[PDB]
Amino acid sequence: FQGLRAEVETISKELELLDRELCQLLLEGLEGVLRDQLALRALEEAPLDGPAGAVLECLVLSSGMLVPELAIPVVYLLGALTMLSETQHKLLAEALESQTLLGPLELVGSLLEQSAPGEGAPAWVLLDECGLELGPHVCWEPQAQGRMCALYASLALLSGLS
Amino acid sequence: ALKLCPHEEFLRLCKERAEEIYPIKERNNRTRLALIICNTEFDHLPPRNGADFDITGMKELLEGLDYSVDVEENLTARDMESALRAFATRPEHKSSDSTFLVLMSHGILEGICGTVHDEKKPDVLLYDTIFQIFNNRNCLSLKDKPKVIIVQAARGANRGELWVRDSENLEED
Amino acid sequence: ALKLCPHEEFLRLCKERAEEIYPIKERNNRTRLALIICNTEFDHLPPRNGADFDITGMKELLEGLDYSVDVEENLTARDMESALRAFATRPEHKSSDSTFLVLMSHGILEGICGTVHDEKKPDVLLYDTIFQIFNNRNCLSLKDKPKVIIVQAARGANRGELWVRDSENLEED
């Protein structure tokens, strides 16, 4: 967990250096990329417009060249988001629009620390999409570790822009 | 190379800007002193390789400005404080008109790091300590004389760059 | 009275020192803003008597320098911070070229005191907070524009006088 949190902070610290207006335009573009997976599949091949087009305008210069100091953090965020389902993606943007990322990030970090190896609750939804047995319930199944670690990165990186 | 000031402009400035500029001792009877402290090797911090180039450059520059340059390398916070108080007590400043203090090491916002500095074992010299050493109370030979403190120590771990709408072979101190 | 620079020297200076001086927006289409914060009455400190004369003097001076002067008095540390972000977010700075921030209160090496400040109950606005508010990250309308912070608050409270070999009716801030 400590090595995972350090791997997250090495990118979260470098995304705090992005501008306030650029963080809002990046957040607006990613919330738009949510609704349309047509933008998600084009990252591996990668001017354009739209949700990913707005994100593209955030990470290019006057000549359109990529900024590796800013493209790599976005590549790492998309790499942690691909391990999650579209239901988890849409619930993450629900937490984005509600601007209450402190609660779920705190709970995921507290769980992730303990695990060294209910119905109608988004966290439970979130945990049901992860693959846990819901009903305290400290019982942890390792089959969902990677998605929860990717969820933690999908949470902390957004808090770095909050 | 370091360009020199012609004799005309030096004297004209001394005539027409007497009360606005700091006085100068006679070149014949002057003893300008400067001090350089530079920590390059550490036990828990990456090495500051290449600082030797900065040491010789500053030393040669200050020598061109007619300064006797003292050099200290790789010291602890106690040794750095002791070296500073020893430099402040040297009597040649009575025959001097100014001084330079070139500090080069890792640092934080509070001050400059020593050789054996760590987050758990902090070995740091505060910037306020320097001004305390060279103020008019502890150093009386440099009263009413310029005191130039040129430091190179990063003061935070955050980069100092942003991004606004419209080489790479260097280490970080 | 405030003497003015003739138009000729203004135009010549901008011509011969273009890359060395900060640019100026045309006086006709300019919206220079300045901010004054001044705490005079406190709950645990004596009041900064006469401060207003300083208040009126600074206001008239900045108006002579073609600045629209907003004035705030007797705020808490939270209220002072809130007023500062509100001033930093004002859109007239996009049509301005500079800004002034005049703050008058008692202060500590760390910053400036509010109205409800005490040793056990500190109400203090930090200097670092100001730079955080008006840096290029939080304030983008004042990018590449001068930012003048004129403060009057002793930061140590230990008299700043000595004695070396060779009126008085005022309170202390």
Added chain:
Amino acid sequence: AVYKTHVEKDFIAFCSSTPHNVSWRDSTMGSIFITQLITCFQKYSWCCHLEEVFRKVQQSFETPRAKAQMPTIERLSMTRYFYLFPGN
């Protein structure tokens, strides 16, 4: 497009007293620091930039009439000279 810039730039702070020291202010006259600053601005703004005016202030504070204080400049990030050009 996007370009690189600094986080901190073009800053200048003029404090009434040196660190750990007292700033003075008179009940009948206001504060000495502000009074001298206003006087130096009235006399030198038309020909000296802001930083040069701050020197004229400090020049007036060399010998201490009665109380002794020295205004100091801190966190100076300006890369250019700021001429105010009064009347322009």
Added chain:
Amino acid sequence: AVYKTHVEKDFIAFCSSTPHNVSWRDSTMGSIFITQLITCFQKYSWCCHLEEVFRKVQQSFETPRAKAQMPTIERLSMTRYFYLFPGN
């Protein structure tokens, strides 16, 4: 007799980076801050005082290529201009 003087006076500190920020250094070329300061001294010492030379340094650090740095002046207590007069 005995007279009054200030506790702090005639100080000037030139730091390689703004607060909370990183200073850079190249193995083969030394440090960017020291190299620029030395170059500005070689080019402007004979006609510009110490503070004016420091401005020339900051001007060279205005627009930033690759990594961005801004050397800042702090605790400026000088009441006069310090011309070095190289060669005199």
